């Protein structure tokens, strides 16, 4: 039996920073 | 001549971690020297004439150096990064020292003969460059992509054309050519096969 | 006879200072190594050795003008190299860090499969271009041909005034070294032999 | 001047190629590979015009024309070659930059002038070869298989701790710590610089005369058999 | 009892026996050898240069501690006259003369048998540069004389 | 709660020269701090000597204490000692209470000296990993084309082996390799539970790969996306991530990303491994477009840090969920690093909420400050069951 908690694909996530623009 | 000597002294004092006052002083002295040299190349060109001024080869060199210095100055403001270093070439204007001596004729005749056979010099240099290119292509075919060893890939490899031509030039100079030979032999199989 | 005078006076001074404690031991060492000039006394006594020494000195005087020109060109190249490479020859012990403030503490050295704790220290390359004298020494080493691939790699990998190296950052800078090899070891040194 | 443009473009195409290990290829590699048969066709057309203008065995009487014909023939064979033994034929396309030597007679005259001063050097090379051979033989008589001993710790995994030869007791270099000099270890430089047979000795002597790493071989002999007499082999070798 | 292994060289000498067939190598080799034997004082001057520089290196950098993974070690050092001459010849040909120069500059760990605890000097710059220049100049002078 | 409240009121001093920080660094016999010499009385319930007067701080070998981030952490974490003491006061039978920061240092109570080389990293610990992010459905794509041969192949193998160590029994992982043809590195063919046996099998399989062929990103990504849509077998039904281990390429393949993940339901993490001059443009573009991140691994020393940082990306939905995403979780029975035997650790993440009253920063508040943990020994459970 797996955990019954899942946290992903939030609408308010920024995700505007990568490792490419910074460096 | 004294102005050129002072310019050489000013440009020879640049060093790492110099005081900011010295940096600003040199920055302004570069402009002052450029303006002075520009005023000595216009007054001497009007007092001699464009055809008579360009007759001497060293005056043509001076004009080229002045144009390059102006280009460096304008290019060092729109994008201040590194710098070509043409402003140092004015130190060659100290070659006027030999004029007052008895060795002016001997040193001037060597430059006259060098300029006389310029096409031969260019042809010889181009033939050397062509042989270097041919050997670089041969090295690219023989060892291109085969230098990826278990440890770090050597910089002196034959993967790209610039790397291959640098390797060929270094082997021509003769420094550490045995290391490149060992790397090639290891790439081709080792001591057993590929020797 | 002047040289004989320095030899004798230095020996006498060393003997006089010997009969005491180690007063200025560095001066004692200097006066001790001064005694090497004893074989030089043989040059005058042997007429043939004096003649060959005179011939060597005459040959040296025959190329003084070209030596001066070569030194001027080398100084110009050294100044250009200082302008291009001053401050950029610093590196951290581990390649992960790029700044002096970051190169502090200890890191893990993954060599010879032992992963040892090694101290991080912001060092400078052995042959650099911080000032004109260091550039002259580096260019002399390059002209001799020993270890010039290392300085070529360091120059190519140099990034900025106070930043650590990055491989293949500025490859075009190799042109400089190529030009150097075209002008000094190849050209200039071959006109010494001819002269 | 249209044939010279074909050559310069071919040279630029050759310089733009990139080689990757184990069969990997960049898209530009295939893009440039697709350009080859137009070059081969242009070269074959020019060769055909020169043939129908000059004949055969006086067109082939010129060495540069012989080189051009060999280049175009190898290219044609590569085009019609599906077999995998084309490496010795695809390595001929590096002579293409030499074709512009044939197109410019001034470069031909310069090359003739530079190469006419190397014939009297040939005898020197012959003498040089003799010297190398002689020294090689001497090496083969003294340093045959002397660099194969190393300080293996305990024959656990046959991994030497130091990259220097041995001599068991003797004036040669000894092991420190818990190591013994067991038989067989490739050699100083991956086992390349040694005097096992005449070919290895010749290669080592040729490396020595160029004064590149000769001191490493001298030190290897010194710590393999003592430093009393090894200088008498290398100093005359370097000098001569 | 007696270490006798040099006699094999005699057999390796048979190569010289076939050097007489060539009518253009013998006349050149003999000519250059006879010119060499006519100018011994140039060689004497070069030998004096080597002697002086070897003695100077002995006096200045003699007591540098021998360490591996460096340029002053059991193979290349200034300890004895023969070792100094070997170092000078190695630098004259040119292998790691810059590395040797860096290996002795004013701050080297000093040997545990000498007197001074900090031996070595920054005089190695001038020493090595002048030695290289003078050796090259005298060798070129000998070449041109021959 | 106390850690969040204290860290909210932080001034972030840029210099610590005049006012040094006072803390007891472990594993000890520099300007910016002053150390503490404790008494270290020998105590029962622990196998070693401990001191209840303060809390010890462990900093990894490759992380330099005295940096601005570390000094600020040692500043604002000094308020946890009072809560440590109070928690012990309410329960004298309490084992280690630890706070592992995202910076890298762990502050644990009671103070005790640390246990050759020390490779311990707090962010690699299972109790930190289970609370740093929710369970996941990792799928590792490996570029095994000709260009990766040499150093950048053993580096990729080591990176994959270290990445597998960040999974647990609640995560599901699979490893696939592609060179103009995609395939599985082993005989699993679908996601596995990523337990000890499956992880060992995958490590053995990835240690035996060879580099040859021409890269084709389209086929590899199609294989990965079709593998992540199985639903025939047991999975985690949580974070779906494709972790790409390559060097460089000239193709970004908008077609595959548009076809498979149109609504961006699968994150893509891309790693550039080795020292090379290949084009990194598409590698970073695929990471940016798919809610992922871009990492560079140029040597072995960068393997450990870069293979653990992706959990910062996966923690954004948890921190943006709010107080509902704050539950105590218990790890599997493992062996304590401080030589205490078999223990289980409670876990509770800590959020960075500086200036959240005005709701204006919201930029670095998407990451966790760290993870709190408390150790429960199996001997206590045995004692509760006579
Ligand atoms: C070959 C492999 C690679 C080689 C690398 C280096 C190759 C070159 C390396 C060494 C060559 C140089 C050797 C020694 C150099 C100079 C010796 C002494 C100066 C010397 O040679 O004389 C210069 C050379 O000028 C240069 O271009 C100055 C030379 C600068 C050359 C730098 C550029 C080199 C790159 C070539 C670029 C293209 C040019 C030519 O002499 P000149 O023609 O100026 O002589 C006149 C003449 O005496 C007149 O009577 C006099 O006018 P009056 O006042 O009416 O008497 C003129 O006075 P002004 O000077 O006021 O006009 C003199 O200047
Ligand atoms: C919790 O989140 C808050 C904000 O949401 C965060 O507080 C912020 O911390 C950063 C530092 O990480 C502060 O940044 C200031 O401004 C710049 C940007 O970092 C710094 O100047 C240099 O910046 C470069 C890169 O931009 C950097 O490499 C360099 O080291 C910096 N310093 C130099 C060159 O000296 C400032 O130094 C930095 N600090 C100042 C100005 O004091 C933000 O200002 C902070 N914002 C707020 C509202 O406080 C906090 O750190 C998060 N919690 C944790 C534990 O990190
Ligand atoms: C145109 C081209 C012309 C080419 C001409 C070439 C001329 C130069 C030739 C140089 C040859 C002499 C140098 C020999 C190298 C010595 C190598 C060596 O290690 O010898 C030691 C050897 C025994 O080795 P050891 O380590 O002592 O014992 C343990 C291993 N057996 O043996 C010993 O125990 C010591 C014996 C060796 C040292 C003395 C050898 C005689 C040298 C006399 C002077 C040079 C004679 C030149 C003869 C020319 C023809 C060969
Ligand atoms: C005026 C001086 C010379 C001028 C030369 C001019 C230029 C010519 C070319 C340069 C010649 C350089 C020759 C260098 C030879 C070095 C020989 C050597 O290193 O041999 C080692 C060994 C003794 O080495 P050492 O360390 O002194 O002693 C160890 C034991 N106590 O050696 C021996 O055992 C030597 C055996 C006897 C040799 C006698 C000579
Ligand atoms: C991070 O470091 C800071 C400086 O090292 C700490 O700031 C210091 O905290 C002290 C304790 O609160 C203060 O001492 C007293 O503060 C009261 C406040 O009203 C005043 O009486 C005085 O300022 C002071 N009294 C005496 C007798 O010293 C310091 O003033 C204060 N600032 C300093 C030392 O510059 C932070 O507390 C620390 N962070 C944490 C979380 O502890
Ligand atoms: C062509 C002619 C006109 C030039 C004459 C010689 C000077 C211009 C050169 C020769 C010595 C050079 C000096 C060589 C050594 C040094 C020391 C150097 O000082 C430092 O490095 C201090 C910084 C530090 O090390 O902490 C500054 C450059 C300076 C004086 C150089 C400045 C330019 C100098 C004075
Ligand atoms: C007698 C002379 C002419 C012999 C040498 C001929 C030079 C013109 C050759 C040898 C070195 C070559 C250089 C070798 C290395 C480089 C750097 C390189 O520049 C790049 O930007 C490479 C791009 C990349 O990083 O992929 C290619 C040009 C350049 C200077 C080459 C240009 C042609 C050079 C200058
Ligand atoms: C399991 O996955 C497959 C495909 O990934 C699903 O589709 C079935 O595939 C099998 C292949 O042998 C075939 O029965 C049919 O092509 C598909 N079945 C259909 C369309 O009913 C399959 O539905 C998934 N689930 C199960 C329980 O098999
Ligand atoms: C002919 C004699 C006097 C040589 C004088 C010309 C020398 C100093 C010139 C000729 C070509 C020049 C180089 C041409 C291109 C570049 C690339 C640039 O990004 C940095 C400077 C650098 C590397 C220049 C340095 C100066 C240079 C080497
Ligand atoms: C006297 C002859 C050789 C003329 C050459 C003089 C110059 C080039 C040489 C001669 C002796 C040398 C000095 C000898 C010893 C030392 C001690 C060292 O810790 C610093 C450098 C210093 C001070 C040297 C500097 C360079 C020096 C002054
Ligand atoms: C292995 O090492 C031991 C001591 O370390 C020593 O007896 C010997 O070198 C080896 N033992 C053998 C060969 O039995
Ligand atoms: Ca060399
Ligand atoms: Ca690839």
DSSP code per residue over E65-131: PP-SSSSSSSSS-SSSHHHHHHHHHHHHH-SSHHHHHHHSSS-EEBPTTSS-SEE--TTHHHHHHHH
What six digits make up the tokens of C37? 């000039």
- C185, C189, C171: which is closest to C139 by C-alpha? C185
Residue carrying structure tokens 């150096």: B65
Q: Which of F200, C11, F179, C70 is nearest to D21 (CA)?
A: F179
B56 is in an annotated binding site: yes
Atom of ligand 2 nearest to the CA of F369: 55
- Looking at residue B154, the DSSP 8-state letter turns out to be P
d(CA B91, CA B97): 12
Backbone torsions φ then ψ of D126, nearest 5 degrees: -55, -55
Of C1, C31, C35, give the one whose Cα is nearest residue C14.
C31
Contact D30, F219 (CB under 8 A): no
Tokens representing residue E4 in the block: 């006798």
Cα-to-centroid distance, B23 and ligand 9 (Å) = 23
The reply to whether residue D21 touches residue F149, judged by beta carbons under 8 angstroms, is yes
Q: Using an 8 Å Cβ cutoff, are D212 and B175 in contact? A: yes
Contacts of D234 (CB under 8 A, 6+ apart): D208, D214, D217, D218, D221
SS (H, E, C) F304-323: HHHCCCHHHHHCHHHHHHCH
- F293-297 and F241-246 beta bridge pairing: unpaired
Number of alpha carbons in the 13 Å side-chain half-sphere of residue E48? 19
- Please name every residue paired with F372 in a beta bridge, in sequence order, or none if there are none: F99, F348
What single-letter DSSP state applies at residue D162? S
Judged by DSSP in three states, F374 sits in: strand
Ligand nearest to the CA of D227: 4
Tokens (6 digits) for B140: 């690219």
Show Cβ contacts of residue C93 under 8 Å, excluding neighbours closer than 6 positions. Answer: C103, C107, C118, C119, C120, C121, C123
Chains D and F touch (3+ CB pairs under 8 A): yes
User: A7 by DSSP, 3-state: which?
Assistant: coil
Burial class (CB in 10 A: 0-12, 13-18, 19+), D95: middle
Question: Resolution of the experimental model in angstroms, please?
Answer: 3.1
Among A2, A8, A13, the strongest candidate for a mutation testing the F interface, having the largest count of F CBs within 10 A, is: A8
What residue spans of chain D are helical by DSSP H? 2-15, 27-33, 36-54, 63-79, 87-90, 99-103, 105-115, 119-142, 198-209, 214-225, 231-239
In whole angstroms, what separates CA F296 from the centre of its chain?
Answer: 16
What does the alpha-carbon distance between residue F210 and residue F338 come to, in Å, rounded to a whole number?
A: 40
Q: Best mutation site among F354, F356, F357, F363 for ligand 2, i.e. most ligand atoms within 8 A of its Cβ?
A: F354
Return the residue of C nearest to F304 by Cα.
C108
What is the rounded distance in angstroms from the CA atom of residue B145 to the CA atom of residue B8?
Answer: 47
Residue contact F149–D22, C-beta within 8 A: yes
Minimum-distance ligand to the CA of B60?
1
Q: Is F219 on the interface with B (CB under 8 A)?
A: no
Q: For residue C28, what are the β-bridge partners?
A: none
Whole-angstrom distance, CA of residue F24 vs CA of residue F36: 5
* Structural contact between residues B145 and B184, judged by C-beta atoms closer than 8 angstroms: no
Answer whether E129's CB lies under 8 Å from E146's CB.
no
Total count of residues recorded for chain A: 23
Per DSSP, the three-state class of B63 is: helix
Query: Per the annotation, does F147 bind a ligand?
Result: yes
Specify whether the CB–CB gap between D105 and D67 falls below 8 A: no
Is the peptide bond prior to C94 cis by the omega test (within 30 degrees of 0)?
Answer: no
Question: How many angstroms separate the Cα of B125 from the Cα of each of B139, B167, B175, F186, F364?
Answer: 21, 18, 21, 58, 60
- A6–F237 CB contact, under 8 Å: yes
User: How many residue pairs bridge chain D and chain E with CB atoms within 8 Å of each other?
Assistant: 40
How far does Cα C138 stand from its chain's mean position? Answer: 6
F26-61 burial string, b = 16+ CB within 10 Å, else e? beeeeebbeebebeeeeeeeeeeebbeebbbbbbbb
Quickly tell me which residue has 């084992």 as its tokens: F95
F323 close to F107: Cβ distance less than 8 angstroms: no
CA–CA gap between residue F169 and residue F195 (Å, rounded): 5
- The tokens for D92 are 């001929």
Q: Atom 14 in ligand 1: which residue has the minimum CA distance? A: B107
Provide the b/e sequence for F85-122 (b: ≥16 CB within 10 Å): beeeeeeeebbbbbbbbbbbbbbbbbbbbbeeeeeebb
Residue F293 backbone phi and psi in degrees, to 5: -155, 160
CA proximity to F33, closest of F19, F14, F53: F19
Q: To test ligand 9's pocket by mutation, which of C152, C177, C179, C182 has the most ligand atoms within 8 angstroms of CB?
A: C179
Of D209, D229, D231, the residue with max ligand 3 atoms within 8 A of its CB, to mutate for a pocket test, comes to: D229
CA distance F325 to F332: 21
Query: String of b and e for C142-151 (b: at least 16 CB within 10 Å)?
Result: bbbbbbbbbb
Contact C145, C82 (CB under 8 A): no
* CA F267 – CA A13 distance, rounded (Å): 13
**Phi and psi of F25, rounded to 5°?**
-80, 135
**Which ligand 7 atom is nearest residue C174's CA?**
30
For residue F296, list chain A residues with Cβ-Cβ distance below 8 A. Answer: 19, 23
> Cα dist. D157→B192, D185, F78 in Å?
22, 13, 51
Query: Which tokens hold the place of F64?
Result: 């330099």
Chain F positions in Cβ-Cβ contact with residue D23 (cut-off 8 Å): 146, 212-214
Cα F225–Cα F160–Cα F267 angle in degrees, nearest 5? 35
Contacting subunits of C (3+ beta carbon pairs below 8 A): B, E, F
Question: Tokens representing D23?
Answer: 């069969």
Dist. CA D146–CA C161, nearest whole Å: 50
CA distances from D100 to B131, D94, D96, D239, F285 (A): 12, 13, 8, 41, 45
Residues 6 or more apart from C90 whose CB is under 8 A from it? C100, C122, C123, C124, C125, C162, C164
Q: Which of F66, F213, B129, F240 is nearest to D11 (CA)?
A: B129
Nearest Cα neighbor of D107 from B127, B132, B118, B128 is B127
Read off the tokens for B42. Answer: 């216009």
Q: How far apart are CA C76 and CA C66, in angstroms?
A: 15
Query: Which of C72, C76, C148, C179 is best to mutate for the B interface (most B CBs within 10 A)?
Result: C76
Give dist(CA F142, CA F224) in Å, integer. Answer: 11
End-to-end CA distance of chain D: 50
Q: How far apart are CA E103 and CA D88, in angstroms?
A: 48
- DSSP structure class, residue F175: E
The DSSP line for F13-82 is -S--SSS-EE-EESS----SEE------EE-TTSSSEEBSSS-EEE--TTS-TTSHHHHHHHHHGGGHHH
d(CA D202, CA D134) in angstroms, rounded, equals 9
* Residue of C181, C157, C178, C180 whose CA lies nearest to C169: C157
Which residues of B fall within a CB distance of 8 Å from F300? none
How far apart are alpha carbons A7 and F351 in whole angstroms? 15
Rounded CA gap, E105 and C137, in Å? Answer: 15
Ligand lying closest to the C-alpha of residue B61: 1
Q: Report the run of H or E that residue B3 belongs to, with start and end.
A: helix B2-11
Q: Name the strand (E) or helix (H) holding F271.
A: strand F267-273
CB contact under 8 A, E48 and C39: yes
Q: Report which secondary-structure segment, H or E, holds D149.
A: strand D149-152
Pairing of strands F182-184, F175-178: antiparallel
Q: CB under 8 Å to D41, separation ≥6 — which residues?
A: none
The Cα-based distances of A11 to B101, D184, F349, F357 in angstroms read 85, 67, 21, 21
Ligand closest to C81 (CA) is 9
Q: What is the dihedral of CA D205, D207, D211, D217, to 10 degrees?
A: -70
Is B133 near ligand 7, meaning CB less than 6 Å away? no
Does F112 carry a binding-site annotation? Answer: no
Pick from D137, D138, D222: which is nearest to E75 by CB?
D222
CB F100 within 8 A of CB F123: yes
- Say yes or no for a CB contact (<8 Å) between F211 and D23: no
Answer whether D34's CB lies under 8 Å from D134's CB. no
Instruction: Give me the phi and psi of F97, to 5 degrees please.
Output: -115, 120
Helices and strands in chain B, H and E counts: 9, 0
Tokens of C148: 């010039």
User: D97–B134: do the CB atoms touch at under 8 Å?
Assistant: yes
CB F135 within 8 A of CB F239: yes
Helices (DSSP H) in chain F: which residue ranges? 2-8, 68-76, 80-90, 126-132, 151-164, 196-206, 217-227, 254-260, 281-289, 303-306, 310-314, 316-321, 378-383
The packing angle between helices D105-115 and B118-143, to 10°, is 80
**Ligand 3 neighbourhood includes E12 CB (under 6 angstroms):** yes
Closest CA to D130 of D234, D231, D206, D214: D206
Query: What sign for the dihedral angle of Cα B137, B142, B145, B149?
Result: negative
Q: How many Å apart are CA C70 and CA C58, to the nearest integer?
A: 19
DSSP secondary structure, D180-193, as one string:
EEEE----SSTT-S
Question: Residue D137 burial by CB count (10 A; 0-12/13-18/19+): exposed, middle or buried?
Answer: buried
Give yes or no for a contact between B187 and B139, defined as CB atoms under 8 angstroms apart. Answer: no
Closest atom, ligand 4, to C-alpha of E80: 27
Residues 6+ apart with CB under 8 A from F136: F167, F171, F172, F236, F238, F239, F240, F241, F314
- Put simply, the answer to whether C146 touches E45 (Cβ < 8 Å) is no
Helical residues (DSSP H) of B41-103, grouped into ranges: 43-46, 50-53, 57-75
Query: What is the experimental method?
Result: cryo-EM
Residue nearest to atom 9 of ligand 2 (CA): F12
Q: Is residue F298 less than 8 Å (CB to CB) from chain B? A: no
């Amino acid at each position: 039996k797996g955990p019954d908690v899942c946290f992903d694909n939030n609408v308010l996530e920024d995700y505007t920073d990568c490792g490419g623009v910074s460096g | 001549l004294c102005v050129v000597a002072l310019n050489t002294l000013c440009v020879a004092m640049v060093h790492y971690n110099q005081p900011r006052r010295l940096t600003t002083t040199l920055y302004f002295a570069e402009f002052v020297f450029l303006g002075l040299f520009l005023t000595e190349m216009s007054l001497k060109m009007y007092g001699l004439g464009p055809r008579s001024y360009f007759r001497s080869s060293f005056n043509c060199f001076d004009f080229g150096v002045i144009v390059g210095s102006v280009f460096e100055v304008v290019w060092a403001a729109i994008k201040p990064g590194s710098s070509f270093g043409i402003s140092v070439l004015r130190a060659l204007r100290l070659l006027r020292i030999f004029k007052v001596t008895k060795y002016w004729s001997s040193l001037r005749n060597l430059v006259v003969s060098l300029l006389n056979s310029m096409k031969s010099i260019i042809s010889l240099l181009f033939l050397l460059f062509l042989f270097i290119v041919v050997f670089a292509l041969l090295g690219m075919q023989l060892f291109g992509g085969q230098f990826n060893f278990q440890d770090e890939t050597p910089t002196t490899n034959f993967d790209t054309f610039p790397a291959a031509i640098l390797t060929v030039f270094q082997i021509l100079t003769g420094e550490d050519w045995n290391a490149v030979m060992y790397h090639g032999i290891e790439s081709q199989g080792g001591v057993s096969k590929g020797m | 006879n002047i040289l004989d005078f320095i030899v004798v006076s230095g020996a006498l001074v060393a003997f006089a200072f010997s009969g005491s404690k180690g007063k200025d031991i560095n001066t004692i060492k200097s006066l001790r190594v001064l005694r090497v000039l004893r074989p030089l006394k043989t040059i005058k006594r042997l007429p043939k050795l004096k003649a060959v020494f005179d011939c060597v000195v005459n040959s040296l005087k025959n190329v003084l003008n070209i030596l001066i020109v070569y030194m001027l060109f080398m100084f110009i190249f050294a100044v250009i190299a200082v302008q291009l490479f001053k401050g950029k020859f610093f590196y951290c012990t581990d390649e992960s860090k790029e700044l002096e403030r970051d190169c502090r503490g200890q890191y893990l050295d993954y060599e010879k499969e032992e992963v040892e704790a090694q101290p991080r220290q912001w060092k400078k390359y052995d042959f650099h271009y911080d000032n004109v004298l260091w550039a002259l020494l580096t260019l002399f080493t390059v002209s001799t041909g020993e270890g010039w691939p290392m300085v070529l790699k360091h120059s190519v990998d140099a990034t900025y005034e106070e930043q650590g190296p990055s491989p293949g950052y500025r490859m075009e800078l190799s042109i400089f070294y190529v030009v150097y090899f075209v002008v000094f070891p190849f050209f200039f040194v071959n006109i010494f032999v001819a002269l | 001047y249209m044939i010279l443009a074909t050559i310069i473009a071919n040279c630029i195409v050759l310089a733009l190629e990139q080689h990757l290990p184990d069969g990997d290829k960049t898209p530009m590699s295939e893009r440039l590979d697709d350009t080859e048969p137009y070059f081969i066709g242009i070269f074959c057309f020019e060769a055909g015009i020169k043939i129908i203008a000059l004949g055969f065995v006086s067109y082939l009487r010129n060495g540069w024309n012989v080189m051009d014909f060999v280049v175009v023939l190898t290219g044609i064979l590569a085009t019609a070659g599906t077999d995998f033994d084309l490496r010795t034929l695809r390595a001929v396309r590096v002579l293409r930059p030499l074709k512009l030597v044939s197109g410019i007679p001034s470069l031909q005259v310069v090359l003739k002038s530079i190469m006419k001063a190397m014939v009297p050097l040939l005898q020197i090379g012959l003498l040089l070869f003799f010297a190398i051979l002689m020294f090689a033989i001497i090496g083969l008589e003294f340093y045959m298989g002397k660099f194969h001993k190393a300080c293996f710790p305990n024959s656990t995994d046959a991994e030497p701790v130091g990259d220097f030869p041995c001599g068991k007791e003797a004036p040669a270099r000894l092991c420190e710590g818990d190591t013994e000099c067991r038989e067989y270890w490739p050699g100083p430089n991956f086992g390349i610089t040694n005097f096992d047979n005449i070919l290895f000795a010749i290669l080592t002597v040729f490396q020595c005369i160029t004064m590149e790493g000769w001191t490493d071989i001298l030190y290897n002999t010194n710590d393999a058999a003592g430093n009393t007499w090894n200088w008498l082999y290398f100093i005359p070798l370097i000098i001569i | 009892f007696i270490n006798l292994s040099f006699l094999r060289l005699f057999r390796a000498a048979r190569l010289i026996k076939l050097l007489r067939q060539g009518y253009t190598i013998r006349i050149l080799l003999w000519t250059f050898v006879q010119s060499f034997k006519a100018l011994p004082y140039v060689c004497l001057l070069i030998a004096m240069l080597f002697f002086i520089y070897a003695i100077i290196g002995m006096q200045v950098f003699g007591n540098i501690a021998l360490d591996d993974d460096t340029s002053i070690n059991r193979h290349n050092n200034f300890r004895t006259f023969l070792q100094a001459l070997m170092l000078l010849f190695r630098s004259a040909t040119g292998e790691a003369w810059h590395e040797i120069m860096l290996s002795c500059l004013s701050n080297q760990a000093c040997d545990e048998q000498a007197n001074a605890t900090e031996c070595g000097s920054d005089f190695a710059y001038f020493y090595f540069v002048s030695f290289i220049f003078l050796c090259s100049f005298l060798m070129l002078n000998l070449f041109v004389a021959v | 709660l106390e850690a969040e409240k204290v860290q909210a009121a932080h001034q972030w001093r840029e210099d610590f020269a005049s006012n040094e920080v006072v803390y007891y660094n472990a594993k000890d016999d520099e300007p910016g701090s002053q150390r503490i010499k404790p008494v270290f009385i020998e105590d029962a319930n622990f196998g070693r000597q401990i001191s209840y007067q303060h809390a010890a701080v462990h900093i990894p070998t490759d992380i330099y204490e005295g940096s601005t981030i570390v000094l600020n952490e040692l500043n604002w974490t000094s308020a946890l000692d009072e809560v440590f003491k109070k928690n012990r006061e309410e329960d004298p039978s309490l084992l280690w209470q630890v706070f592992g920061s995202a910076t890298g240092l762990a502050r644990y109570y009671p103070a005790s000296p640390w246990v050759k080389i020390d490779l311990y990293d707090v962010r690699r610990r299972p109790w930190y990993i289970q609370g740093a992010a929710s369970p996941k459905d990792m799928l590792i794509l490996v570029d095994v084309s000709g260009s990766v041969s040499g150093l950048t192949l053993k580096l990729i193998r080591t990176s994959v082996s270290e990445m597998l160590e960040t999974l647990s029994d609640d995560d599901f992982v699979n490893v696939a390799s592609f060179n103009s043809n995609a395939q599985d590195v082993s005989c699993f063919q679908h996601l596995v539970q990523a337990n000890v046996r499956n992880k060992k099998v995958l490590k053995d399989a990835v240690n035996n790969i060879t580099a040859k062929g021409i890269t084709d990103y389209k086929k590899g990504f199609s294989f990965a996306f079709e593998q992540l849509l199985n639903y025939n077998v047991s999975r985690a039904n949580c974070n779906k991530i494709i972790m790409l281990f390559t060097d460089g390429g000239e193709e970004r393949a908008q077609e595959i990303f548009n076809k498979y993940n149109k609504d961006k339901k699968v994150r893509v993490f891309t790693f550039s491994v080795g020292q090379h001059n290949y084009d990194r443009g598409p590698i970073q573009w695929m990471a940016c477009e798919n809610k992922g991140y871009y990492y560079e691994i140029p040597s072995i020393g960068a393997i450990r840090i870069n293979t653990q940082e992706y959990l910062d990306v996966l923690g954004r939905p948890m921190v943006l969920a709010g107080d509902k995403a704050k539950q105590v979780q218990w790890t599997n029975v493992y062996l304590d690093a401080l030589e205490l035997g078999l223990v289980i650790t409670g876990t509770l993440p800590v959020f960075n909420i500086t200036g959240q009253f005005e709701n204006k920063t919201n930029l670095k508040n998407q990451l966790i400050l760290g993870v709190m943990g408390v150790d429960v020994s199996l001997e206590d459970i045995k004692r509760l069951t006579p």
